[PDB]
Amino acid sequence: ADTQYILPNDIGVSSLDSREAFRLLSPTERLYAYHLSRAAWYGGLAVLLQTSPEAPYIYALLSRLFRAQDPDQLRQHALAEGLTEEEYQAFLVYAAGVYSNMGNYKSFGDTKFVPNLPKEKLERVILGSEAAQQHPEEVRGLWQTCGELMFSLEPRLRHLGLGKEGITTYFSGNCTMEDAKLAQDFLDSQNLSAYNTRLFKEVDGCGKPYYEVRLASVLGSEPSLDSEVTSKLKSYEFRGSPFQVTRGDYAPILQKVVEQLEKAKAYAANSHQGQMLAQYIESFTQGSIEAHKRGSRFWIQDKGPIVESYIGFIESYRDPFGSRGEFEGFVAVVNKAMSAKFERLVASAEQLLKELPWPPTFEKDKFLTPDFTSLDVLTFAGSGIPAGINIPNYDDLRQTEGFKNVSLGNVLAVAYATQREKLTFLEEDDKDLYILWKGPSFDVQVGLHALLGHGSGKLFVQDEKGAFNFDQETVINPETGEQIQSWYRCGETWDSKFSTIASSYEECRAESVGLYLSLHPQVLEIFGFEGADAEDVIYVNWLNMVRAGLLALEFYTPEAFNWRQAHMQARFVILRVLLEAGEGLVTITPTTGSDGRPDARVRLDRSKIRSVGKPALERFLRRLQVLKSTGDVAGGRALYEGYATVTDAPPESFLTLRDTVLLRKESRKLIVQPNTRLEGSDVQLLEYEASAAGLIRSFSERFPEDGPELEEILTQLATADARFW
Amino acid sequence: DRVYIHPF
Ligand SMILES: [K+]
Ligand SMILES: [Mg+2]
């Protein structure tokens, strides 16, 4: 039984398999991946600053400790200081958790986690450590600074968020949702993207708030060749409030990033890779999203490479408002073999899009023939590793120029196997079917989710002067029969319009497309499923979604009435929609397992999937796209937050079921990633044990050049902004 | 936009 805000000692750890994909790379391709990976791991440290006030200190303390003494050496000291093997293991798991999440908050769930041992016992280990003997001042200093917050589980520190009842470093501690809304209106008016920005509010002597929008860049207040960002660097007046646009956020870190990006540029395969890197450098040096947009523009044209990569402030999941981006970056080898079926899905994607429950007027003008490859991840820096990605997030690029889809093949392989004894909330007659097809089912789901899901739908946009990207005279809204009366104006994006629900809303739309189009035989045939096996995959895919809808209650916060994980909230909604259809399709039954503790069961009538589930899902999917395309945020919130409402209403009683979900929950696996070392000319791949100590070791050897320098940098950046929280 | 697998 897992404990909230605590990583269990027996937490699953899997090492990313990357030996074969790396063994195929040419010397130049290896050197290319080597420097790109270093750029990713460098910038990945910025996530610490984007997580919690104490996260940079904790990483600095852990890095110091394990540099002087590896887990086996530190074991001998810790056990001599009174720590049991269990208590020491708890510290190893915590450290590995901080490393893999780049912070003391889970990327998947946004909950704080603390070390599972006495604080006074860990103190003796740290103060008596070898790192403390070599540098007593900075070790005692770090422990004094982050020690309290390392263990504290005060209610306002338990979850990420704005307001006084949450923690965030995207904003200063005194910021609220009202502040975030005012900032977004200012940002939209200046056509300034929020992706690489943070917001800080300081009050003057009077008490009047002053707002600072700090951009992420190497350069600061000093003049430079750029004018696009330079001209923006000034004070503003917005609705009575004074705004100031600055830059230089994570400056020494991004400095390390552009160094490795520039070195990787000398090993680029083509001009597409060469120009996109130069633009990323421009973006990270100047603070220009446009420069990153220009880079992404070249990146999309780099069709089916050998080493695929992407880097920057990409996703906006962990921003409580939902517009600011968390830094990430990945380097992967395109698995030509597994990428065959995905290109096959693209080849018939244009016709598949027509099967979607909305008129072509709400679909993109032209099918853009996007790249879709199966990837073997070498490096995925940041807070967490996804199963698949649809990028870039710039919708003006995806609806006009193009986009890319990637399925992380060596990531799917981790959760491919299934243990029957650890299955939860499933009927016994379904367990064998679930095990046999769970793997293959999400492989199809990932493909549809990214390509047919994220890659579908048009946004109605009106430019600054009249002209609509659609024809308002002919286009009619299906749900009302009237002409379009709502759209996106200039400067408005998906994230700016729907804000706090933008992520989850879209994932719900994407997940729904996946389920809906998994009924189509030609889709399953592409992934190699026909006849009896085909309907089995369908049944399991729907069984999984309904099951996941129940598991999702783990990621809901009752006292705040707030969902913490977008994809999980999305699956709970779909569960609710299928429950709403009735007809005995889906039922949730509170039971009592052999454990003796409260349990639950989920039943899904296979025969009523196409007759009841599909039309209900088709109705729901139509509503989603309509409100999305028109930017009807009021209707969107009315529709989505309705199904996303968690209550103890009969017969389900979700609030009571939530307690059962938490009681039988299983922690998500930590993933150990390999390292690449350069022996002057040749590049080698270092692998590690699939354990906490193995994950720790992977970071100890991750920065052999300037490790202690990064600790100092992260410490400096943290102290500089300490007054904010 | 990202795609996730749960449980993982
Ligand atoms: K978002
Ligand atoms: Mg807060």
Numbering used by the authors:
A (entry chain A): 2 to 726
B (entry chain B): 1 to 8
What is written in the article reporting this PDB entry?
Human dipeptidyl peptidase III (hDPP III), also known as enkephalinase B, is a member of the M49 family of zinc dependent metallopeptidases and cleaves dipeptides sequentially from the N-terminus of various bioactive peptide substrates. Crystal structures have so far been determined for DPP III from humans as well as from Saccharomyces cerevisiae. Despite the low sequence identity (36%) shared by the two proteins, both structures are very similar and consist of two lobes separated by a wide cleft. The “upper” lobe is mostly α-helical and contains the zinc binding site as well as the catalytically important residues. In both structures, two histidine residues (His-450 and His-455 in the human enzyme) and a glutamate (Glu-508) coordinate the zinc ion.
